[PDB]
Ligand binder design. Structure first.
Ligand code: I3P
Length: 255
């Protein structure tokens, strides 16, 4: 019947036309193909049509997204489809969830986590000099650390509190950095930055203590052997450094 290939699929998805996907499920089942197959991924990056959809929004929406996820499910492919990684010059291991978070799409984030997105997928930075030139924007690799570092408390709440699959607040990336180290990494000592970073830091610190009363999140060490406080001191992050100190002092005064 209707025939689908990569340029056709990507045309439909980049325009955001749900009607264009009529016939695709039947096509995939009849020809024994999957949306993760090489023929339906961008050769240069590894993107399936899912990242393509998320990068092509109209008023924040692309109605092919729910349809593609359903098609992936019905072809026994849902997990692989959702979590299929891609790369560019800056990161490898990027997933659809990273895109949905970076584009601030709360609804798509929920949809993807509900249908089995890897809440701990790591977008690892790429470098081209012999010592990491830091050409990429570092946010701690993980979806939770991305949400935190981009000032999205609702997504932070969702990712840690949802009933399907929760991001672990204690998680560490490839540098050994927890979300707290990541917040320190992105701190730049400007007023609005210092304001959201300290608020996010405390929200996560308190939430960790509540869930794991035995556990002090700001005690966990990165691979340099540094706590967030000490990383902050070493890297000149004055505003967050000072806030952690006053908070530590206030916390002892409480008891
Ligand atoms: O400074 P705060 O207190 O952290 O407030 C956040 C700020 O307004 C963000 O710009 C916003 O993201 P949007 O631009 O997408 O609205 C976020 O919404 P969120 O919590 O729903 O992620 C707010 O929480």
């Amino acid at each position: 019947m209707k025939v689908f290939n990569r340029p056709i699929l990507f045309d439909i998805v980049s325009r955001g036309s749900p009607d264009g996907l009529e016939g695709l499920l039947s096509f995939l089942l009849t020809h024994k193909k999957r949306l993760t197959d090489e023929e339906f991924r961008e050769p240069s990056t590894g993107k399936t049509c899912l990242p393509k959809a998320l990068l092509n929004l109209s008023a924040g929406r692309n109605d092919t997204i729910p349809i593609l996820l359903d098609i992936a499910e019905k072809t026994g492919n849902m997990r692989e489809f959702i979590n299929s990684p891609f790369r560019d010059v800056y990161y490898r291991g990027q997933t659809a969830l990273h895109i949905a978070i970076e584009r601030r799409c709360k609804h798509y984030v929920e949809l993807l986590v509900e249908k089995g997105a890897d809440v701990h997928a790591q977008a690892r930075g790429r470098f081209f000099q012999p010592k990491d030139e830091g050409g990429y924007f570092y946010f701690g690799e993980l979806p939770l650390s991305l949400a935190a570092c981009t000032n999205q408390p609702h997504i932070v709440h969702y990712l840690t509190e949802n009933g399907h699959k929760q991001a672990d607040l204690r998680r560490q990336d490839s540098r050994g950095n927890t979300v707290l180290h990541a917040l320190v990494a992105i701190a730049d000592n400007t007023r609005e930055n210092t304001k959201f970073v300290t608020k996010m830091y405390d929200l996560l610190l308190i939430k960790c203590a509540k869930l794991f009363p035995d556990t002090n999140l700001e005690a966990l060490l990165n691979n340099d052997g540094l706590s967030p406080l000490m990383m902050a001191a070493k890297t000149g992050k004055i505003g967050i450094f000072q806030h952690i100190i006053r908070r530590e002092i206030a916390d002892a005064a409480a008891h």
